[PDB]
Ligand binder design. Sequence first.
Ligand SMILES: Cc1cc2nc3c(=O)[nH]c(=O)nc-3n(C[C@H](O)[C@H](O)[C@H](O)COP(=O)(O)OP(=O)(O)OC[C@H]3O[C@@H](n4cnc5c(N)ncnc54)[C@H](O)[C@@H]3O)c2cc1C
Ligand SMILES: Cc1cc2nc3c(=O)[nH]c(=O)nc-3n(C[C@H](O)[C@H](O)[C@H](O)COP(=O)(O)OP(=O)(O)OC[C@H]3O[C@@H](n4cnc5c(N)ncnc54)[C@H](O)[C@@H]3O)c2cc1C
Ligand SMILES: *SC[C@H](NC(=O)CC[C@H](N)C(=O)O)C(=O)NCC(=O)O
Ligand SMILES: *SC[C@H](NC(=O)CC[C@H](N)C(=O)O)C(=O)NCC(=O)O
Ligand SMILES: *[C@@H]1O[C@H](CO)[C@@H](O)[C@H](O)[C@H]1NC(C)=O
Ligand SMILES: *[C@@H]1O[C@H](CO)[C@@H](O)[C@H](O)[C@H]1NC(C)=O
Lengths: 461, 461
Amino acid sequence: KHYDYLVIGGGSGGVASARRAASYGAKTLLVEAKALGGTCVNVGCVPKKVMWYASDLATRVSHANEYGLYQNLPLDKEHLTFNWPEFKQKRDAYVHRLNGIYQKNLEKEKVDVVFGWARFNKDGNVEVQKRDNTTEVYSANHILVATGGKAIFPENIPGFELGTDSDGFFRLEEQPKKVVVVGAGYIGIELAGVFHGLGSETHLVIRGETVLRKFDECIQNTITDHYVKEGINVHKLSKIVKVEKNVTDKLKIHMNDSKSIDDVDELIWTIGRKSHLGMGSENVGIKLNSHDQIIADEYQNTNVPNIYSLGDVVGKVELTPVAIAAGRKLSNRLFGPEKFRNDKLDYENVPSVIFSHPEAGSIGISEKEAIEKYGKENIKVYNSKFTAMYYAMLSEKSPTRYKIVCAGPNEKVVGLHIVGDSSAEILQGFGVAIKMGATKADFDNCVAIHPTSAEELVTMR
Amino acid sequence: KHYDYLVIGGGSGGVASARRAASYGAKTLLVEAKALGGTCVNVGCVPKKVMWYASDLATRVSHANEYGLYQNLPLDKEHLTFNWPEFKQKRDAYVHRLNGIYQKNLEKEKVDVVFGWARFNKDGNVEVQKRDNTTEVYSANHILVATGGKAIFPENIPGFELGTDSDGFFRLEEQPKKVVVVGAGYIGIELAGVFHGLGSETHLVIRGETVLRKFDECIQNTITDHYVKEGINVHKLSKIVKVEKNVTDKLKIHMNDSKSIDDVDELIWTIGRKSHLGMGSENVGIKLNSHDQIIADEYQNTNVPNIYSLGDVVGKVELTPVAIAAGRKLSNRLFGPEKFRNDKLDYENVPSVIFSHPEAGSIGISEKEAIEKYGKENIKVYNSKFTAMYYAMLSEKSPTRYKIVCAGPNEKVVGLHIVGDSSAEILQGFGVAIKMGATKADFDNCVAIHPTSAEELVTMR
Ligand SMILES: Cc1cc2nc3c(=O)[nH]c(=O)nc-3n(C[C@H](O)[C@H](O)[C@H](O)COP(=O)(O)OP(=O)(O)OC[C@H]3O[C@@H](n4cnc5c(N)ncnc54)[C@H](O)[C@@H]3O)c2cc1C
Ligand SMILES: Cc1cc2nc3c(=O)[nH]c(=O)nc-3n(C[C@H](O)[C@H](O)[C@H](O)COP(=O)(O)OP(=O)(O)OC[C@H]3O[C@@H](n4cnc5c(N)ncnc54)[C@H](O)[C@@H]3O)c2cc1C
Ligand SMILES: *SC[C@H](NC(=O)CC[C@H](N)C(=O)O)C(=O)NCC(=O)O
Ligand SMILES: *SC[C@H](NC(=O)CC[C@H](N)C(=O)O)C(=O)NCC(=O)O
Ligand SMILES: *[C@@H]1O[C@H](CO)[C@@H](O)[C@H](O)[C@H]1NC(C)=O
Ligand SMILES: *[C@@H]1O[C@H](CO)[C@@H](O)[C@H](O)[C@H]1NC(C)=O
């Protein structure tokens, strides 16, 4: 009936926060409507990366013959086959095991877990409609709303329902021969890369001239250009204006430039996500912003006493590690030692990665943002363009592009943006240095590791 | 016939130093007896990593079927083939191409290049026997000796001449079916990994219980154990006492414990390197240590006025980036602006990598060294053991092992030691942070990147 901490949402932030609270001794209840691990584990980071690994390997196999390997076998694009149904099962099995582990951990850390739809009632308590069909009402001293987000559909577009969202991607049981992905965000860029690496004719529809418009132009241009060069059909300056189903059962996409894409087996909208508001938040007076996101201050406090919110539902830096960290720091503050009274997450200079092909990474501000904030006169930029040594033995090539953005007379690194193989793994350490206030001189103050790609970052202009 | 700077040795340090000196306006002469780029380019870092890419890809292809790819093709260990002769040709082509680029750069940066054996005469000048069949004598105000090293042969062992060294590895025209590598050093560990990944029955002979005994025990144990598990035959507590050749043309290697390895096609000694002397060191008074290495102070000064030395010939931290950096800083000091009159390389906390399978990385001191230096009571160690997500879809597995060694009440990071896929690329950034004086709290002060392996380093114990 009554708890110290009740968490609505079994995702990245909810799970982390519940666990941290319980670690400090706090009768904690966690309510999840679907599966533990939320978006990341079930239809996000995890299954996307597994598919990424498959796509990545498909490409690598096409290099083997040149690398002198398996020369009696035709390891080329033409003979590429991918057993989508079987791989799908293994992927689902892995995700299912992770759910089990999560449920196991929460029980062992003494967090009570209930499955059902949670909602606020007028009294300020939480009604949970259970999966055993009962409906229980619970009370608590502290309540965290970490319900995450959900894909946006372009409901103004006739035929829009004929396509799915990223969740739909993960439900696909067969591989589409021809796929159209809409949106220049990282989710779409990643899915498009995966589809193409696995053999599907792949189309990516974007409003502007370049993908990944939230990132530095170096990332935008390199990924845009490489996607086009490798065979991903990028429709620039385009918006879908109508979708229809044929004789054949395939879709036909109608663009605003009057062009079209015919014989499409699958259409996926990846045009943003919105806050997953299903609770009775109105029943407790939780203020929403003009984008229907829950408002939260720097301590994750909503406007309502003893109600907190974080993660995608708030919508500030929508990444799994961020929610986890905010979740943990909130629990430190509410239930931890006195030294954590003012604990909060620093949301600036969070590094992030795009599992495109090639991968990309970014932390800090873009060159354009740096010029705006500090003025041209005070921005120094370092660039490096090269092809990794791995491609020396190959006719096919992939770009590596490193950009360091510096501000002030000490050349403080305010942005680091990279494109190329291994970027995902390279960035973390540099992230630690940048959070330490690293300058260009600091990057230069570590001897290089040879031969590597990362090495280029400590020996530029 | 007279120069500002004469550099003996066209390798990592020599080339870097010559170019930096010439950049400042200095009539510079570079003398190389073989090929520009030295050990690294011709018989070191470069061709070893190219071969590494081959073995790495060979392993990767054996995971493709599991990853649902090319399932009509038998992509297993049993069907592995490697066209060693053809790949050798491409590898040499790439190296030859790098030689050309170096010659091009140097003559573009106004360094005179002469091929020949250089030696000091009694006058203190340098006579060079050329390929003109000429023999000129040159004088200079400043002389750098950067002649590198060479493999040690165990001349006390009968039949020792029946094996080669790492140079010989790169001369191999055909793949040996059964190969023996001797020594626990990083060069032999790498070569053993390559041989095994490419299908040869591989044997590694070591004096102790573990490989890589200069590194932290975590690296030693993990690589040792994985090599055994893999199928690399590691002969521990052993030493070769006799080598012989049969009828057959194959070798029989006799051990000190009365065991044997017969039908061996190739034997490679990788038991250390020694300074490559042979110039007229004696004619000029250059002092050598008890290991026959040239002595050099913190400014790379030998005991002789206007004669400097660095790189493998001195033998302090034998890596390409180190020689390059020392070469550059020397030129800054000798010919650069007033600013650099006390420029010198910091040889502490130089990061280094081992291209084993899996790769490993290390910077700073081992746990044992820390305890010895700071005392048990002041050392805290963080460990993390896990299998990368890539293996989730596979039956075969590979370990990832991260160790952070901390000293003092601020938990200053004094050692970072890692084993696992991507380690080579992960380490650099962390190296920058350690040279900044990173503490554990600093590692923790950057938000994680999910999903990656590096992530584990900023979220530990
Ligand atoms: C395709 C895709 C790929 C991504 N890849 C990455 C990546 O590689 N790296 C990364 O850092 N981030 C990635 N993200 C983002 C990441 O998934 C999110 O930032 C993260 O999941 C947010 O966690 P959260 O706790 O805010 O909410 P979520 O993780 O979304 O979990 C919210 C939970 O609340 C539950 N819930 C909602 N309402 C109720 C209710 N009323 N009662 C009970 N339960 C309820 C939902 O079932 C859900 O389980 C990806 C996202 C997507 C969509
Ligand atoms: C198998 C192997 C793998 C390695 N892998 C790596 C790696 O991955 N990363 C890394 O950082 N390091 C690696 N190293 C180490 C690296 O190669 C050396 O540290 C580096 O080459 C040292 O450069 P140097 O300038 O000191 O001498 P070198 O690079 O050895 O060059 C010395 C030059 O001097 C010339 N010379 C000698 N005497 C004379 C003379 N009398 N007249 C004219 N010329 C002369 C030689 O021909 C040679 O070209 C590896 C080494 C080996 C052997
Ligand atoms: S990825 C190569 C880099 N390109 C960019 O940085 C583009 C930046 C935008 N154009 C900006 O916002 O202005 C790069 O290194 N460019 C170097 C160059 O000289 O163009
Ligand atoms: S790679 C795993 C780590 N092992 C070691 O550090 C071995 C060290 C030596 N054998 C030694 O200290 O004698 C590891 O995680 N060790 C954890 C530990 O508690 O030692
Ligand atoms: C189609 O829509 C895009 C996206 O807004 C726009 O840039 C482009 O100009 C439009 N094409 C037309 C109207 O010709
Ligand atoms: C063989 O040599 C190794 C290395 O010195 C030593 O450890 C071992 O004890 C020797 N074995 C015997 C039986 O002498």
